[PDB]
Amino acid sequence: LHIPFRLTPTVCPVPLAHTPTVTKWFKGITLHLTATRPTLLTTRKLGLRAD
Amino acid sequence: EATTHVTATGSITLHFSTSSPQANFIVSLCGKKTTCNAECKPPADHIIG
């Protein structure tokens, strides 16, 4: 017997967070981040060691 | 710019990017070599895109 309701791939919207304000200081940046809900920030260096 | 247009008795402007405090390098215009030599200042912008 067929089990109905297959997982179809479907396009669906997700929120866009507040655009960060970046202040630049020598060898570094500072992001002023406002997010009402929890928001994932992921940073990595583009060298040999990606911290 | 790689290829320029040279007519007669004129001047052409070009842009370069360097990593040295001194610009002391050889420019070959169409066969002839010249030594461009002066000082470069550190940037005021700390972070670039």
d(CA B41, CA B25): 16
Contacts of B19 (CB under 8 A, 6+ apart): none
In angstroms, rounded to a whole number, what is the distance separating the alpha carbons of residues A43 and B46? 19
CB of B14 within 8 A of CB of B7? no
Beta bridge partners of B35: B26
Residues 3-32 (B) with a CB less than 8 A from some CB of A: none
CA A16 remoteness from chain centre: 9
Within an 8 Å CB–CB cutoff, is residue B46 touching chain A? Answer: yes
Chain B residue whose CA is closest to A25? B46
Do A29 and B45 count as a contact with CB atoms less than 8 A apart? no
